[PDB]
Amino acid sequence: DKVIDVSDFGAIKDTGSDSTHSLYKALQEAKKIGATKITFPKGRYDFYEERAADRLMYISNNDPGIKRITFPLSSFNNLEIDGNNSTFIFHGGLVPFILDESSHIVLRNFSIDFSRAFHSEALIAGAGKGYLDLKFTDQFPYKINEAGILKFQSQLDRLKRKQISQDEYKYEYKRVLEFNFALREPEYMAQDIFTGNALRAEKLNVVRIFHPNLKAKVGNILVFQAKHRDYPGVVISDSNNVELHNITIHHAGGMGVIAQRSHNITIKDSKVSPSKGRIVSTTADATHFVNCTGKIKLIDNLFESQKNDATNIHGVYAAIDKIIDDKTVEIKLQHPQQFGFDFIAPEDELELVHGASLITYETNKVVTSTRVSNEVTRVQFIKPFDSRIKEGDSVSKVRSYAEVIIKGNIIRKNRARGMLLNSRGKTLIENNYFHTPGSAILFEGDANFWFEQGGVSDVTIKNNVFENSFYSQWGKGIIAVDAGIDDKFKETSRYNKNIVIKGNTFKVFDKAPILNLFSVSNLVFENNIIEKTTEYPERKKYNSLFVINNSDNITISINNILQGFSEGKSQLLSPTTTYKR
């Protein structure tokens, strides 16, 4: 009627049977009749590959290919999916949700998990020169083949072997990271150890893995980082007015929520958090927004234990590959996880940017655009473009940049950074808790490897708590700039502008930078409380709370408060150019 009950289409809870086809039929009926809601009788629902719809997808900062989709929400309008706090379990290579060219879609009250994680975890039972001894629990099956290589499996007749073998790709790894057993966070100062996808291994007649760079503390947990990003949790693509309310994402092969080229997204009262027996949630970013517009609201969420940043809101740079004539260029997407990102349309305004400095030469209007491939697009401008532009420079679309509201979130226990603020729109970061091994807030962006467009223009960071963040090495300080500006251009490049950091509590354990800035104009750091702790060992390489280079109009104000420090506030609040002296 107005509300469609998925059990009227044969999806039965708690049985363990596949509910994919019944779900599909309920979705098509909702589109046929104009229903505004689908409800699940509260229970457990399982979804498998065999009857899932298949679609080519490019998904920014994730891996492209054929996706099997359990909720294929393409061209839906004005539809709410209320799971009534049901539990959704996905078996194998599924993308749970893709919202494609949809509008006013509300997702509420369910959880997402996969029956076997894409990553794997092990207890570290011993260590030595070039090896670790590991105990795996049952939920991470593996085989050690005749070659002496550790290969994780989907599960423990010739065609069943063949399909299991075909599953091996999904559980490939590329690096390992040590997690502290007691704190359930990346181990203090441990770093990613690259291994590649094949580790020599042997079972001691416990599994021993061999690699020259292995180093960890016994009793900690070793995480094998999933190599691939093929199965993100919720994809929001070319869509508008999407809300996620009380969604729990226990796991994904890649990001928890990834949005590209969409407009108005809210994520509220949701959580990314591990399920029973796991120390890791999603295998990449909890959330992530590419070329999005309107309001992006992250309200009152819990993001913990994912293998990457909690959020990143940014644009796409594309390199100028070939100059065809004075008015025409071919641009090329650079990073493999950007291939297929079409964004340049007739009448768009583009920034033309010098690659090594991130200085904008000019803006220009595009009159025509032709997609040549999933890499190359040809672009014709209305007037001849600036004569200084060379091949190797980049373009970025001048958007109505997203207004970013990030309020009331708890961000902790994840690998890497807290928030990558590459939002050039009006940005508000207020009343969040950060406990991250990397930079809690990082202004990044580059046009040489990730080709992500950042460059802040209006940022307010007010009344957050930064507790012993940046306790490892993914970043350059608690709040830091690592934008891709060559040293030669730092003094003249001003990439991030107009930043107010007021009313925060920084609980710090050593004298690593609270602020580490370059190429900034107009930043005010006032009315903050800085308070010394002993939560982690002090690192002797840091002796400066405020490292500032190649910036202007930076006020580190006198009205900040310092508690528990040996030295006086006038030494401690005084900027250096270096970490030490």
Ligand SMILES: O=S(=O)(O)OC[C@H]1O[C@H](O[C@H]2[C@@H](O)[C@@H](CO)O[C@@H](O)[C@@H]2OS(=O)(=O)O)[C@H](OS(=O)(=O)O)[C@@H](O)[C@H]1O[C@@H]1O[C@H](CO)[C@H](O)[C@H](O[C@H]2O[C@H](CO)[C@H](O)[C@H](O)[C@H]2O)[C@H]1OS(=O)(=O)O
């Ligand atoms: O230098 S770090 O800040 O620590 O970056 C970490 C880095 O890890 C791997 O590369 C390093 C290690 O492999 C290490 C092992 O001994 O050797 C180092 O010298 C390598 O450093 S290097 O890459 O700077 O040359 C990653 O490669 S690997 O998995 O094949 O081993 C490498 O890509 C890089 O990982 C990135 O670290 C970031 C935090 O520092 C962040 O998590 C990146 O992902 C997210 O951020 C970027 C924007 O910066 C994009 O938005 C991504 O989509 C986000 O997911 C992370 O990249 S990724 O996980 O490989 O995709």
Ligand SMILES: [Cl-]
């Ligand atoms: Cl009906």
Ligand SMILES: [Cl-]
């Ligand atoms: Cl039922």
Ligand SMILES: [Cl-]
């Ligand atoms: Cl779809």
Ligand SMILES: [Cl-]
């Ligand atoms: Cl609508």
Ligand SMILES: [Cl-]
């Ligand atoms: Cl299961």
Ligand SMILES: [Cl-]
């Ligand atoms: Cl095959």
Ligand SMILES: [Cl-]
């Ligand atoms: Cl659980």
Ligand SMILES: [Cl-]
């Ligand atoms: Cl990854």
Ligand SMILES: [Cl-]
């Ligand atoms: Cl140059």
Ligand SMILES: [Cl-]
């Ligand atoms: Cl943006």
Ligand SMILES: [Cl-]
């Ligand atoms: Cl030192």
Ligand SMILES: [Cl-]
């Ligand atoms: Cl002052």
